[PDB]
Each structure stands twice: as C-alpha cells, then as structure tokens.
Design an enzyme around this catalytic site. Structure first.
Site, PDB file in Angstrom:
ATOM      1  N   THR A  16       1.279  13.064   7.254  1.00  0.00           N
ATOM      2  CA  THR A  16       1.240  11.644   6.911  1.00  0.00           C
ATOM      3  C   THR A  16       1.308  10.740   8.154  1.00  0.00           C
ATOM      4  O   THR A  16       1.139   9.523   8.047  1.00  0.00           O
ATOM      5  CB  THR A  16       2.415  11.231   5.940  1.00  0.00           C
ATOM      6  OG1 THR A  16       3.682  11.703   6.448  1.00  0.00           O
ATOM      7  CG2 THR A  16       2.218  11.793   4.528  1.00  0.00           C
ATOM      8  N   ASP A  39     -25.718  26.064  12.787  1.00  0.00           N
ATOM      9  CA  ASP A  39     -25.455  25.621  14.139  1.00  0.00           C
ATOM     10  C   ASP A  39     -26.123  26.563  15.138  1.00  0.00           C
ATOM     11  O   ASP A  39     -27.201  27.087  14.832  1.00  0.00           O
ATOM     12  CB  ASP A  39     -23.932  25.554  14.350  1.00  0.00           C
ATOM     13  CG  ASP A  39     -23.548  24.493  15.352  1.00  0.00           C
ATOM     14  OD1 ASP A  39     -23.795  24.707  16.548  1.00  0.00           O
ATOM     15  OD2 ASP A  39     -23.029  23.430  14.929  1.00  0.00           O
ATOM     16  N   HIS A  69     -21.298  26.064  20.976  1.00  0.00           N
ATOM     17  CA  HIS A  69     -21.044  24.966  20.024  1.00  0.00           C
ATOM     18  C   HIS A  69     -20.778  25.514  18.617  1.00  0.00           C
ATOM     19  O   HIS A  69     -19.795  25.144  17.988  1.00  0.00           O
ATOM     20  CB  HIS A  69     -22.222  23.953  20.086  1.00  0.00           C
ATOM     21  CG  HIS A  69     -22.125  22.793  19.140  1.00  0.00           C
ATOM     22  ND1 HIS A  69     -21.632  21.555  19.516  1.00  0.00           N
ATOM     23  CD2 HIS A  69     -22.556  22.654  17.865  1.00  0.00           C
ATOM     24  CE1 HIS A  69     -21.706  20.725  18.490  1.00  0.00           C
ATOM     25  NE2 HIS A  69     -22.263  21.369  17.477  1.00  0.00           N
ATOM     26  N   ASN A 161     -22.884  10.792  17.038  1.00  0.00           N
ATOM     27  CA  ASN A 161     -22.064  10.373  18.185  1.00  0.00           C
ATOM     28  C   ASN A 161     -22.644   9.218  18.971  1.00  0.00           C
ATOM     29  O   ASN A 161     -22.585   9.222  20.193  1.00  0.00           O
ATOM     30  CB  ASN A 161     -21.861  11.554  19.158  1.00  0.00           C
ATOM     31  CG  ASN A 161     -21.239  12.776  18.474  1.00  0.00           C
ATOM     32  OD1 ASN A 161     -20.366  12.644  17.634  1.00  0.00           O
ATOM     33  ND2 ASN A 161     -21.711  13.954  18.820  1.00  0.00           N
ATOM     34  N   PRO A 175     -26.637  10.268   0.861  1.00  0.00           N
ATOM     35  CA  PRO A 175     -25.515   9.828   0.018  1.00  0.00           C
ATOM     36  C   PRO A 175     -24.739  10.957  -0.683  1.00  0.00           C
ATOM     37  O   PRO A 175     -23.523  10.856  -0.881  1.00  0.00           O
ATOM     38  CB  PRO A 175     -26.201   8.931  -1.018  1.00  0.00           C
ATOM     39  CG  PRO A 175     -27.477   8.461  -0.323  1.00  0.00           C
ATOM     40  CD  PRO A 175     -27.916   9.664   0.439  1.00  0.00           C
ATOM     41  N   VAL A 177     -24.001  14.023   0.178  1.00  0.00           N
ATOM     42  CA  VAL A 177     -23.187  14.973   0.964  1.00  0.00           C
ATOM     43  C   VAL A 177     -22.000  14.263   1.640  1.00  0.00           C
ATOM     44  O   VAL A 177     -21.899  13.042   1.617  1.00  0.00           O
ATOM     45  CB  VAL A 177     -24.022  15.751   2.007  1.00  0.00           C
ATOM     46  CG1 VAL A 177     -25.204  16.465   1.323  1.00  0.00           C
ATOM     47  CG2 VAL A 177     -24.500  14.805   3.149  1.00  0.00           C
ATOM     48  N   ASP A 200     -18.066   9.085   4.514  1.00  0.00           N
ATOM     49  CA  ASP A 200     -17.179   9.406   3.404  1.00  0.00           C
ATOM     50  C   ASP A 200     -15.754   9.615   3.848  1.00  0.00           C
ATOM     51  O   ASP A 200     -14.827   9.380   3.057  1.00  0.00           O
ATOM     52  CB  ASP A 200     -17.642  10.656   2.670  1.00  0.00           C
ATOM     53  CG  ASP A 200     -18.993  10.488   2.069  1.00  0.00           C
ATOM     54  OD1 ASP A 200     -19.093   9.831   1.003  1.00  0.00           O
ATOM     55  OD2 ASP A 200     -19.955  11.016   2.669  1.00  0.00           O
ATOM     56  N   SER A 224     -19.210  16.516  15.611  1.00  0.00           N
ATOM     57  CA  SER A 224     -19.339  17.981  15.455  1.00  0.00           C
ATOM     58  C   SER A 224     -17.976  18.706  15.231  1.00  0.00           C
ATOM     59  O   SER A 224     -17.894  19.743  14.571  1.00  0.00           O
ATOM     60  CB  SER A 224     -20.021  18.550  16.695  1.00  0.00           C
ATOM     61  OG  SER A 224     -20.388  19.903  16.482  1.00  0.00           O
ATOM     62  N   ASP A 260      -5.064   3.971   7.979  1.00  0.00           N
ATOM     63  CA  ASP A 260      -4.237   4.344   9.152  1.00  0.00           C
ATOM     64  C   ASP A 260      -4.984   4.363  10.490  1.00  0.00           C
ATOM     65  O   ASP A 260      -4.361   4.375  11.571  1.00  0.00           O
ATOM     66  CB  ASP A 260      -3.558   5.698   8.919  1.00  0.00           C
ATOM     67  CG  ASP A 260      -2.542   5.649   7.799  1.00  0.00           C
ATOM     68  OD1 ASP A 260      -1.892   4.578   7.653  1.00  0.00           O
ATOM     69  OD2 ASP A 260      -2.411   6.659   7.061  1.00  0.00           O
TER      70      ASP A 260
END
Ligand SMILES: [Ca+2]
Length: 279
Positions: A16, A39, A69, A161, A175, A177, A200, A224, A260
């Site tokens: 939290t 990937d 990666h 990024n 939208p 995913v 999201d 990523s 937050d």
C-alpha cells in the site's frame, strides 16, 4: 509468503506504500498458470527459471535470446528471485531479433500463434501473454492483440517509452488489451512512460532488476519492465481464482493503489498494480 530484500518492483506490487523491500504473495505463486513472453526469446537454461521456462516458437534462425530483453521480461514474470509469479510456466515466442527489432508481420504471426498454441499447453488456471514491444499505430497489430485477448489470453502490452500519448502506438492503443505504463520507486510516473486514455494500469518500470542472458542479472528500465509485472500479477491472480483472462485487466484496475502516482497527466488513470495480498 515473504521474500525479503526483493527487487523494489515486487515489494511495490504487494504494498500500500512505496519504500518497502519485502515481497508478500500467496504461496500458490501462479502455479498451474502459463505466461507467454513474446519478445527476443528466453534463456530457459537460466537457473532462475528452474526448468519452468521453454522456448515454443521463433521466426528466426535460432530460438535463443541473443539479446537479453526477453529474458529480463520473463524473469520479472516468473523467475524464482525476480518474478511476480514464481511458480508459473513460461513460454517464449521469439518475434524480435537479437537487435530487439521485428517486422509487424512477424509480431502479428506470434500473437496468432499463442492464440492457437495455448491449446497445446497445460494451463488449468489460465493463460497470459506479455508483450513488451510496440511501434507506430497499426490497425492490423491492434487487431492481432484483440484476437489473442478474445481467444482467452490475458494480454498485457507496454504503453511505450516516448513520453507521449499511447493512442499513437500499437499494440498499446488497442482498447481490449491491458496497456501498461511505467512508474519509479518513488511513485513517480517514469520519465519515458507513455500516457493517455488508452492506458489501463501502471507497474514498476524504472531500475528493475531481473534475469539476463549468460545466466546473469541486470537492472534496466522501460514500460517493457512494467508490463511483465502486470502479466505476472494476472497469472498469480488467476491461480488464486480471483479473476479470469477476460476480466483480469479490469480486476487489476479495480484493486489497484489509486491516486498515488505523481506526474500522471490529466485524463490518464492513476492506478498502480497491487496484489491486495494480506499475509
Ligand atoms: Ca487498453
């Protein structure tokens, strides 16, 4: 379960509040779930994967991760030390070459592959796909991501990024995913993280320690890195029976830490992935 001195991202996902270093999670740990990491591949022989990782597909001359990666991302999903879902099965789909590049056509093919291939895997608790990649808007790329999701796979994708609105990137702008922005250990939006209405959720993405090729480890940064936190979280929540592939993105948003994060642009969700685990 409690893992002391965990990477800050793992600690954050079970907390939290920022600034703690222990990761708390149900010991079920994503057992019986599967996560596809689409990937540069996965170094399956890394001790950190414990035999739970496997390459299932490549579009190149080798299935080896010659980059690192994909291996880093997979490590955040499910490595024993650096992973969110420490007991999940990891499947590597190499749509990116060893330079981290990939034609959109190959990326699409990899998505459609996983939508079929899950029928060849044993994943009684459910299936997740982590896509730490993207490029400019493409309706075909978004459509492929939408298919994979529709098929019964919880699809998590990087926002990108560019410190830019993710509406202009794919699969980030799809939208249906779960599009994932990045944050740092001080609960700031990561400086490079895309934003916008298409996001999201946020997960840890700055200075993320995980596996690397050559059986090593490293800290790197990106949406990523945030994406596999969310993918691992979904796998974990699915094994717990809390949610399903179709509803997991909503469930994560519903149960997120709210309001937050700092430097969240007006109109972007202020939600940070959180496992709501009570030890
Ligand atoms: Ca979305």
């Amino acid at each position: 379960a409690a893992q002391t001195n965990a990477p800050w991202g793992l600690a954050r996902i079970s907390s939290t509040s920022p600034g703690t270093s222990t990761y708390y999670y149900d010991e079920s740990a994503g057992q019986g779930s599967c996560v596809y990491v689409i990937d540069t591949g996965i170094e399956a022989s890394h001790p950190e994967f414990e035999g739970r990782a496997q390459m299932v597909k490549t579009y190149y001359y080798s299935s080896r991760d010659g980059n690192g990666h994909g291996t880093h991302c997979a490590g955040t999903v499910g490595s024993r030390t650096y992973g969110v879902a420490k007991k999940t099965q990891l499947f590597g789909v190499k749509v990116l070459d060893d330079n981290g590049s990939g034609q959109y056509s190959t990326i699409i093919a990899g998505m459609d592959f996983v939508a079929s291939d899950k029928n060849n895997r044993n994943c009684p608790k459910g299936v997740v796909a982590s896509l730490s990649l993207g490029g400019g808007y493409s309706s075909s790329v978004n459509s492929a991501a939408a298919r994979l999701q529709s098929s019964g796979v919880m699809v998590a994708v990087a926002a990108g990024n560019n410190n830019a609105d993710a509406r202009n990137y794919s699969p980030a702008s799809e939208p249906s995913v779960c599009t994932v922005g990045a944050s740092d250990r001080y609960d700031r939006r990561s400086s490079f993280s895309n934003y916008g209405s298409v996001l999201d959720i946020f997960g840890p993405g700055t200075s993320i320690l995980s596996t690397w090729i050559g059986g090593s480890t490293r800290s790197i940064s990106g949406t990523s890195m945030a994406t596999p936190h969310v993918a691992g979280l979904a796998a974990y929540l699915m094994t717990l029976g809390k949610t399903t592939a179709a509803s997991a993105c909503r469930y994560i948003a519903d149960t997120a830490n709210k309001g937050d994060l700092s430097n969240i642009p007006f109109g972007t969700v202020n939600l940070l992935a959180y496992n709501n685990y009570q030890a």
